[PDB]
Amino acid sequence: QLPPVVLLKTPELVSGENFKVMPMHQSQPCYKTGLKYTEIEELVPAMAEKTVTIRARVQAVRGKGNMVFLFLRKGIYTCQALVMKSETISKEFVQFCQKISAESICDITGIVKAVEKPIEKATQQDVEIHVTSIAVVSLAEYPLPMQIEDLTFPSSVFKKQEEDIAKVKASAQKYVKVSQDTRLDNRMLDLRTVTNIAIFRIQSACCGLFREFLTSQKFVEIHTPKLIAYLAQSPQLYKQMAIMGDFRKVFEVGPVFRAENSNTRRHLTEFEGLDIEMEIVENYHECIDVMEKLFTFIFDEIPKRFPDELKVIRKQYPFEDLIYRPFLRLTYKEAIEMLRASGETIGDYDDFTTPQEVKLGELIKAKYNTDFYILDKFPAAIRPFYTMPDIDDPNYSNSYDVFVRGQEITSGAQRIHDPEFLMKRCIEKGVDPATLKDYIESFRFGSWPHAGCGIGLERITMLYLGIPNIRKVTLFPRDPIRLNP
Amino acid sequence: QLPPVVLLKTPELVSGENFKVMPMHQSQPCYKTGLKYTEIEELVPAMAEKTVTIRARVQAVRGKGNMVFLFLRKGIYTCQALVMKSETISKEFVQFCQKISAESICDITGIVKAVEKPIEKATQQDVEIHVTSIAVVSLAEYPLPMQIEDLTFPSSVFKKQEEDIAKKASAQKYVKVSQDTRLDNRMLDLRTVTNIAIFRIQSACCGLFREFLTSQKFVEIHTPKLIYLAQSPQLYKQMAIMGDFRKVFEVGPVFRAENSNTRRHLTEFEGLDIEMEIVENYHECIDVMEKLFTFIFDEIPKRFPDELKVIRKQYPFEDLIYRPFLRLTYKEAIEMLRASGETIGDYDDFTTPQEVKLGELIKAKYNTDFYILDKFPAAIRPFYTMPDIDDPNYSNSYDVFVRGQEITSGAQRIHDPEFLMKRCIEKGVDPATLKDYIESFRFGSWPHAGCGIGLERITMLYLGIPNIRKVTLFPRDPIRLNP
Known part of the structure; x- marks a missing residue:
């Protein structure tokens, strides 16, 4: 009675220029971006309008056709990322993001913009990321x-x-x-x-x-x-x-x-x-x-x-x-x-x-x-x-x-x-x-x-x-x- | 074929006032001296003529009738203690000390006196203890x-x-x-x-x-x-x-x-x-x-x-x-x-x-x-x-x-x-x-x-x-x- 390993399905994303599934990480040149990774706890009103890239878990994807909200987690900290259709973010960009499975590890680049209304579910409540690029490092299987x-x-x-x-x-x-x-x-x-x-x-x-x-x-x-013994x-x-x-x-x-x-x-x-x-x-x-x-x-x-x-x-x-x-x-x-x-x-x-x-x-x-x-x-x-x-x-x-x-x-x-x-x-x-x-x-x-x-x-x-x-x-x-x- | 524990003999010392085998330590009032224990490493020419008491191992006993040299060890440090017959240290004091078995744990009180000739075998070479009192805390068995x-x-x-x-x-x-x-x-x-x-x-x-x-x-x-x-x-x-x-x-x-x-x-x-x-x-x-x-x-x-x-x-x-x-x-x-x-x-x-x-x-x-x-x-x-x-x-x-x-x-x-x-x-x-x-x-x-x-x-x-x-x-x- 030998129980085999089960391997569930992962989503089929269609990659593009600024939204791609990376190849499996083998410590290889394409992963040598030379960027500065910013920690989520550092995302603070102090750095509105700066651009950042951060490797985190996509805990959750709430999606709206033209707007996709990514809930990011990393250790004890969490924040919000916003993908919005535009001249520079395409229909294909959005639908890529809407199809990311929960818990996928991603590198998200964006500009940190302020939020007049606080984001009660996140630890970083007073700021959110407007995304300009995404790269899936490890795409999660589903359903969890x-x-x-x-x-x-x-x-x-x-x-x-x-x-x-x-x-009753x-x-x-x-x-x-x-x-x-x-x-x-x-x-x-x-x-x-x-x-x-x-x-x-x-x-x-x-x-x-x-x-x-x-x-x-x-x-x-x-x-x-x-x-x-x-x-x-x-x-x-x-x-x-x-x-x-x-x-x-x-x-x-x-x-x-x-x-x-x-x-x-x-x-x-x-x-x-x-x-x-x-x-x-x-x-x-x-x-x-x-x-x-x-x-x-x-x-x-x-x-x-x-x-x-x-x-x-x-x-x-x-x-x-x-x-x-x-x-x-x-x-x-x-x-x-x-x-x-x-x-x-x-x-x-x-x-x-x-x-x-x-x-x-x-x-x-x-x-x-x-x-x-x-x-x-x-x-x-x-x-x-x-x-x-x-x-x-x-x-x-x-x-x-x-x-x-x-x-x-x-x-x-x-x-x-x-x-x-x-x-x-x-x-x-x-x-x-x-x-x-x-x-x-x-x-x-x-x-x-x-x-x-x-x-x-x-x-x-x-x-x-x-x-x-x-x-x-x-x-x-x-x-x-x-x-x- | 069950090999029993063997227990070798310990020496029969005759205790006195300033040289005694203590009773087994049960965290009891007689062990509450209120003294200050000095660490061997602190024994240094700095404190000649001060009196000290230190709990150490008696590694070795070289003896001379009227003089007994105790080689003390404690961790990585060692020093020399001297028991010498006098008006205040008796024949019975000396022969007690000469009969201490190797590795016995002791509390040794004495005055730290200088030595013009260094003691090459000890880590504390420039100073030795002139004993005024000893107390065996745990008497060792023999032979090692x-x-x-x-x-x-x-x-x-x-x-x-x-x-x-x-x-x-x-x-x-x-x-x-x-x-x-x-x-x-x-x-x-x-x-x-x-x-x-x-x-x-x-x-x-x-x-x-x-x-x-x-x-x-x-x-x-x-x-x-x-x-x-x-x-x-x-x-x-x-x-x-x-x-x-x-x-x-x-x-x-x-x-x-x-x-x-x-x-x-x-x-x-x-x-x-x-x-x-x-x-x-x-x-x-x-x-x-x-x-x-x-x-x-x-x-x-x-x-x-x-x-x-x-x-x-x-x-x-x-x-x-x-x-x-x-x-x-x-x-x-x-x-x-x-x-x-x-x-x-x-x-x-x-x-x-x-x-x-x-x-x-x-x-x-x-x-x-x-x-x-x-x-x-x-x-x-x-x-x-x-x-x-x-x-x-x-x-x-x-x-x-x-x-x-x-x-x-x-x-x-x-x-x-x-x-x-x-x-x-x-x-x-x-x-x-x-x-x-x-x-x-x-x-x-x-x-x-x-x-x-x-x-x-x-x-x-x-x-x-x-x-x-x-x-x-x-x-x-x-x-x-x-x-």
């Missing part, structure tokens, strides 16, 4: 599986739509969107929406700032093996071994594999993990202190460096800006204390249900007015065997979780660096020391007190932007039910 | 599988050793067991100042690569590795461009299923990848590389001078020459090698000796270690490669070389689905095998090009180190999964 326009609508248009269907003749009509597989089967088309390109710039921002900040602190980026569930083991190799402060940005078969609405069997590990001098809170600094940096800088992207996301998926000062520090105990006061029955050493984490978020938001906090001193029974126990009560440990919008983004701990004790705990959690000889043995020859972190990139970005589904924040969505594309 | 000193010697030490035996008393020198006694104790090996330096420079490549491309408004992406595994993150990179991302890079693992052990290849490595839209010509992409690499190369010495210094003592090399960045074509390259006497044929891959040879040719003529070979034969490149308009037996692809050896490979790629599919069939590849990839180019498709760089490769070739395993942190191959 999905319209971009109704991929970009905010729910609100849809709330007001389905409620306008109180009508022709209830025409409201508008519809297609389902997460018609978009997943055409993921690359979906990613062209301005919201999506914006979402993944902000994911890129989290990654970049995480790297930039830790580097400014003289951390060393490392790359540990994933073919451990099984995969690296957690890059933790090697991270620790890097510290026993006197690296002092290390981080890794890499894939993390959850063999755990897990589909709720926020978990997957492969994600990208931002990990940190460091020597510790007096106290493991030194490690929590680096996080606070670290995250505050990510959260301070994101709006300074990507204001437009944030703007574009908010239209599609409304959210209010994360409140991250103060960074609240509680203990598991205090948390249990609050939830019980809220009516929950929970017991001293129990992991929290996801709802309970959200409820605690709402408690904390009301009392301290932050979306950002850290839960310290988790129960040993919930944490792994490498976790350093608390000196006052071994039923608790030197570990912590960090929360954004009442939900976990990272988890971390001081770890056991004494081999005898590490092995005692390894047996107490029913784990064969034989299974990880080399790891245990690597702590024998003088061993730094240390702690660290595991952050989910998808998770932090999702929670930063208040987006409820993790799949909207992963580029090519991965899970046990979904392989393609 | 390997001495750190003879892990750090430069090849030259053994040449000069055996030739000094041109000569009764003889100079026996040292030596060190094969790459498995070090691989079986990799974390011990990585403590050598050379090694900690090498991997900071690997880190430097990664960071600068990220920093530069980010300053150019590139977007970092993370594409799935559970595809089977992702041999090349190329397919998804291209799909990100068809998603209007414009300029993307990925830093991630790349998996060579190819069973390959020469002295420079492995079945898992870290790849730095780039992909971008292309307006007029794919040399726009080559232009970003030149800028990109020149940045990595310009910045590395500015930001890590000491690490370079430390590496050069172990493994001598002269600084990479990377200006000019030379651009040749495959044709010109063949022309040079033929003129050098090689018989090669127009569309043949180069043997490794031939690449190194061409490196030598280029060094002699242009005096650079850094170049790019453009216009490779189609027959040697993959089916997504855009062919050259003048001659379809060539293609719009290129390899970049450092010290006459490949560090990256790249190309303009085919963005027209019918033609991509024609080529896909000409290279005997089932289009059905990659429907979604091919179909993703159907709805308007940007001309594009990009790159695949080997991190390990660029850092190895940057530092003139011959074995790739010296430049991978936890060496991986089909014969070596452990460690």
Whole structure:
């Protein structure tokens, strides 16, 4: 059952002098125009009556016989182009343009002329291009599986739509969107929406700032093996071994594999993990202190460096800006204390249900007015065997979780660096020391007190932007039910 | 046949007031000294007669009854500490110190005193610590599988050793067991100042690569590795461009299923990848590389001078020459090698000796270690490669070389689905095998090009180190999964 490739039809344009379909680009002299390409964001009342040429997507073609309006897009910016019949623009020019298929990539030359009436659908509202020439670089097939326009609508248009269907003749009509597989089967088309390109710039921002900040602190980026021949569930083991190799402060940005078969609405069997590990001098809170600094940096800088992207996301998926000062520090105990006061029955050493984490978020938001906090001193029974126990009560440990919008983004701990004790705990959690000889043995020859972190990139970005589904924040969505594309 | 963990013995020290083994660190009040920890690099004649306390490794203990010399290390820096019997430092203090095992982590307090005679083995040569207190934070087991000193010697030490035996008393020198006694104790090996330096420079490549491309408004992406595994993150990179991302890079693992052990290849490595839209010509992409690499190369010495210094003592090399960045074509390259006497044929891959040879040719003529070979034969490149308009037996692809050896490979790629599919069939590849990839180019498709760089490769070739395993942190191959 071998499914062949399908190839849909492209339009049959009749080319002319100033309106042509270019030959396939092979980096060849005819594409060496020597022109200056102008970026759409630069189209501004500043340059009325200048001529420009710009390589953009023809998102849409509204057409009027003598006038054709081209809606151009490129990245997060959009503008309007106008082809009008004249002494210098012919019937054949116009009908060429009216027949361009949606999403075709074009080079459009024209004179930027002002518009007394603003163009509400475009980002460049106060100016439009009067075309003098066009060249199709890559002519799109048709019909698209999905319209971009109704991929970009905010729910609100849809709330007001389905409620306008109180009508209970022709209830025409409201508008519809297609389902997460018609978009997943055409993921690359979906990613062209301005919201999506914006979402993944902000994911890129989290990654970049995480790297930039830790580097400014003289951390060393490392790359540990994933073919451990099984995969690296957690890059933790090697991270620790890097510290026993006197690296002092290390981080890794890499894939993390959850063999755990897990589909709720926020978990997957492969994600990208931002990990940190460091020597510790007096106290493991030194490690929590680096996080606070670290995250505050990510959260301070994101709006300074990507204001437009944030703007574009908010239209599609409304959210209010994360409140991250103060960074609240509680203990598991205090948390249990609050939830019980809220009516929950929970017991001293129990992991929290996801709802309970959200409820605690709402408690904390009301009392301290932050979306950002850290839960310290988790129960040993919930944490792994490498976790350093608390000196006052071994039923608790030197570990912590960090929360954004009442939900976990990272988890971390001081770890056991004494081999005898590490092995005692390894047996107490029913784990064969034989299974990880080399790891245990690597702590024998003088061993730094240390702690660290595991952050989910998808998770932090999702929670930063208040987006409820993790799949909207992963580029090519991965899970046990979904392989393609 | 289950091999249990072995745990060797630690010394039995008798602790006191100013010389004690601390209890296991559990982030507890007794460790909250409120002192100021001084970094070894700061120990300088500037602060003679100031008192300091510093957490370092006790690399070595030379002892004299009434005097104990502690050789301290910490990262790439080393210094000397002196414990001397007195009114305030006792017999019991001294014999505690003489019994500290190698590599024990310590907090050493003392007064920094000057030394009229320099201490040649330490990085801090003009000053030493007179100890007033010590606290063992983590006491090491013994014996170590390997001495750190003879892990750090430069090849030259053994040449000069055996030739000094041109000569009764003889100079026996040292030596060190094969790459498995070090691989079986990799974390011990990585403590050598050379090694900690090498991997900071690997880190430097990664960071600068990220920093530069980010300053150019590139977007970092993370594409799935559970595809089977992702041999090349190329397919998804291209799909990100068809998603209007414009300029993307990925830093991630790349998996060579190819069973390959020469002295420079492995079945898992870290790849730095780039992909971008292309307006007029794919040399726009080559232009970003030149800028990109020149940045990595310009910045590395500015930001890590000491690490370079430390590496050069172990493994001598002269600084990479990377200006000019030379651009040749495959044709010109063949022309040079033929003129050098090689018989090669127009569309043949180069043997490794031939690449190194061409490196030598280029060094002699242009005096650079850094170049790019453009216009490779189609027959040697993959089916997504855009062919050259003048001659379809060539293609719009290129390899970049450092010290006459490949560090990256790249190309303009085919963005027209019918033609991509024609080529896909000409290279005997089932289009059905990659429907979604091919179909993703159907709805308007940007001309594009990009790159695949080997991190390990660029850092190895940057530092003139011959074995790739010296430049991978936890060496991986089909014969070596452990460690």
